[PDB]
Design an enzyme around this catalytic site. Structure first.
Site, PDB file in Angstrom:
ATOM      1  N   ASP A   1       0.777  -1.238   0.000  1.00  0.00           N
ATOM      2  CA  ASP A   1       0.000   0.000   0.000  1.00  0.00           C
ATOM      3  C   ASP A   1       0.810   1.291   0.000  1.00  0.00           C
ATOM      4  O   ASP A   1       0.338   2.339  -0.471  1.00  0.00           O
ATOM      5  CB  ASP A   1      -1.010  -0.013   1.140  1.00  0.00           C
ATOM      6  CG  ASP A   1      -1.948  -1.177   1.040  1.00  0.00           C
ATOM      7  OD1 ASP A   1      -2.208  -1.590  -0.091  1.00  0.00           O
ATOM      8  OD2 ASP A   1      -2.404  -1.701   2.068  1.00  0.00           O
TER       9      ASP A   1
ATOM     10  N   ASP B   1       1.048  -1.156   4.815  1.00  0.00           N
ATOM     11  CA  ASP B   1      -0.216  -1.791   4.434  1.00  0.00           C
ATOM     12  C   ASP B   1      -1.342  -1.311   5.344  1.00  0.00           C
ATOM     13  O   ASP B   1      -1.250  -1.413   6.550  1.00  0.00           O
ATOM     14  CB  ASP B   1      -0.125  -3.312   4.472  1.00  0.00           C
ATOM     15  CG  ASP B   1       0.216  -3.916   3.118  1.00  0.00           C
ATOM     16  OD1 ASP B   1       0.643  -3.172   2.193  1.00  0.00           O
ATOM     17  OD2 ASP B   1       0.041  -5.152   2.995  1.00  0.00           O
TER      18      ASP B   1
ATOM     19  N   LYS C   1      -5.533  -1.294   6.348  1.00  0.00           N
ATOM     20  CA  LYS C   1      -6.684  -2.173   6.284  1.00  0.00           C
ATOM     21  C   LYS C   1      -7.899  -1.635   6.983  1.00  0.00           C
ATOM     22  O   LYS C   1      -7.920  -1.574   8.210  1.00  0.00           O
ATOM     23  CB  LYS C   1      -6.350  -3.529   6.880  1.00  0.00           C
ATOM     24  CG  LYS C   1      -7.073  -4.687   6.196  1.00  0.00           C
ATOM     25  CD  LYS C   1      -8.545  -4.733   6.522  1.00  0.00           C
ATOM     26  CE  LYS C   1      -9.295  -5.552   5.476  1.00  0.00           C
ATOM     27  NZ  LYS C   1      -9.908  -4.712   4.403  1.00  0.00           N
TER      28      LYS C   1
END
Length: 568
Positions: free
Chosen positions: A439, A456, A458
DNA sequence: TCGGATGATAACGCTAGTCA
DNA sequence: ATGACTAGCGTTATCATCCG
């Protein structure tokens, strides 16, 4: 009961706004047509088919929300025609001969917004108004039709907002306008970061830069382009693309949905600026906020206070609320006046004193008298706390607390968080979404210990124990950054970092974490020999404060990756 | 793109059967 | 000695990017 009016998503043809208004005027050709033709030939369900034709035959036309909107199916292609509005308007390609419940709700909101259709709470029904009647009867293309529409528009606060935003003659984009439209930085008012957007549009292969143009926009950006589109047809704004030089040098990208104001547009503002009473409804004060009730009314009361009085100290304002039922705090009260200002109501500011310099028509605040009984949620409480503690950090970033909790917002969180790491913490880097890129890529350039990080994000509803499948994804990237073989991940994302970096950490950003965040973490660390950590949005924020205040460096943080959860 | 279109999701709310 | 209430679960209101 609780409905959302005031904000219109899909609808763009005035051509169809009319048909929808007319279905409410017994004496119009369309009322006739929809009732005699459209309905009987398209509503397959016999029971309903008859029922509606009937409602349309009464003397005093009044239709309920359901009668006009109907329902829809999960698989949108298999939906039947269950309502008046659906039946009135046609598909984009005549796939079915009717529009769905959503677009239908859209035409309802638009017509109500411009004041042609009135809403009757009690019955949850709607009926035409005097100007609606006059709108129908007006001939198409009429200078009357135009003036009717233009006067309608001038009563619509958010459309006065677009106009205001462009007084100075700037060429703003749907992103610039979006930023400042409605209760910005809240559930149903999120905006796409133009920086990141243009950037990707730049360094990304053509095989994808079209999809990422037609697709990239937040709910507020949609409203912006749309209200900007109406004003365009009415001649109050001029929609034109804006080119940007984004040397990847002397490169040029573009955002089509951009606007400039016109003369006629400026006249409109001059008039509607006090040099046309605006309509404001309580359902307008918040769209997708889970705490619609509390907040819509707290804000409603605030508008009341300001309508009634004139030039009060935010303390007097706080005071009044405390009496009406709401014991709030300066931070929140100011934030709401920031929204009210943003939706297009004119409230003037002098230091710590506010004064509404606008004429809005009286409106209704549902379930009043029981106001004092409305409770403030734990999330809304957390927000205040944050709004209080965050002195250096823009309160907009408190939107992250929400986005991070929305499963439908994976995309944008990836964008918002890298943005926060860059603009606030100060890391250099890039957002890299995808199936072949982590990401984000982050890196220091100043510290005595210059390092990098693999990010990353989420978005997960209420909780998150780092799943094994997702956990290993990182391992793969962590690994690729070592074996920089282009025959392994030939996009060569590692290439985002300065050659000179060697110290790399890996990090996971989410709402809240639980029980797994260490297990697979320690695993990853032992395996690649790269230590990483797990981090929550609240701490991400109260870390951005520290880095700004002076209370935190960008070294103590590099020394924060303890193969566990980071906490400042 | 223009003007919607789509599958998802959480709050709602209806049933049928418990709770006080 | 029965109205008030609610676990379960299908329905509705509302997206947040998507797309023909």
């Amino acid at each position: 009961k609780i409905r959302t009016f005031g904000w219109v998503q899909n609808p763009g043809k005035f051509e169809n706004l009319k048909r929808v208004v007319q279905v409410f005027d017994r004496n119009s050709k369309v009322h006739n047509e929809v009732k005699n033709i459209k309905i009987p030939t398209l509503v397959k369900e016999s029971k309903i088919q008859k029922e509606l034709v009937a409602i349309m035959n009464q003397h005093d036309l009044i239709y309920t929300y359901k009668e006009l909107v109907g329902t829809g199916t999960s698989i949108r292609s298999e939906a039947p025609c269950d309502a008046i509005i659906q039946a009135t308007i046609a598909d984009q390609g005549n796939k079915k001969g009717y529009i769905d419940n959503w677009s239908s709700d859209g035409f309802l909101r638009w017509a109500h917004a411009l004041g042609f259709i009135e809403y009757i709470n009690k019955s949850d029904s709607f009926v035409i108004t005097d100007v609606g009647l006059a709108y129908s009867k007006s001939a198409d293309g009429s200078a009357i039709e135009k003036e009717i529409l233009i006067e309608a528009i001038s009563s619509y606060p958010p459309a006065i907002r677009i106009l205001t935003l462009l007084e100075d003659g700037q060429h703003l984009t749907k992103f610039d306008l979006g930023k400042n439209l409605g209760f910005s930085g809240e559930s149903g008012f999120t905006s796409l970061p133009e920086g990141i957007l243009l950037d990707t549009l730049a360094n990304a292969m053509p095989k994808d830069k079209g999809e990422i143009r037609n697709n990239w926009e937040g709910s507020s950006d949609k409203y912006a382009r749309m209200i900007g589109g109406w004003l365009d047809k009415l001649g109050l704004v001029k929609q034109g693309k804006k080119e940007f030089i984004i040397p990847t040098p002397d490169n040029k990208e573009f955002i089509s949905h951009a606007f400039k104001i016109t003369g006629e547009g400026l006249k409109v503002l001059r008039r509607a600026k006090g040099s046309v009473p605006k309509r404001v409804y309580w359902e307008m004060l918040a769209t997708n906020l889970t705490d619609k009730e509390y907040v819509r009314t707290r804000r409603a009361l605030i508008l009341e206070i300001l309508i009634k009085a004139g030039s009060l100290k935010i303390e007097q304002i706080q005071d009044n609320l405390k009496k009406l039922g709401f014991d709030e705090v300066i931070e929140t009260i100011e934030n709401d006046i920031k929204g009210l200002i943003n939706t297009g109501i004119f409230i003037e500011i002098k230091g710590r004193f506010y004064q509404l310099k606008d004429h809005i028509l009286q409106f209704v605040i549902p379930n009043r008298g029981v106001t004092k009984q409305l409770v403030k949620s734990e999330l809304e409480e957390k927000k205040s706390e944050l709004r209080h503690k965050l002195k250096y950090v823009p309160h907009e970033y408190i939107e992250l607390i929400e986005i991070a909790r929305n499963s439908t917002q994976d995309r944008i969180l990836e964008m918002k968080v890298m943005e926060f790491f860059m603009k606030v913490y100060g890391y250099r880097g890039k957002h890299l979404g995808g199936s072949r890129k982590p990401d984000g890529a982050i890196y220091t350039v100043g510290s005595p210990i210059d390092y990098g990080v693999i990010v990353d994000t989420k978005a997960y509803s209420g909780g998150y124990n780092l799943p094994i499948g997702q956990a290993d994804e990182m391992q793969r990237y962590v690994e690729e950054n070592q074996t920089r073989n282009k025959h392994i991940n030939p996009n060569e994302w590692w290439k985002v970092y300065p050659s000179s970096v060697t110290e790399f950490k890996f990090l996971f950003v989410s709402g809240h974490f639980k029980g797994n965040y260490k297990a697979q973490l320690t695993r990853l660390n032992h395996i690649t020999n790269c230590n990483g950590a797990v981090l929550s949005v609240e701490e991400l924020l109260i870390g951005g404060e520290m880095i700004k205040a002076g209370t935190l460096t960008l070294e103590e943080v590099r020394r924060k990756f303890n193969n566990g959860e980071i906490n400042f």
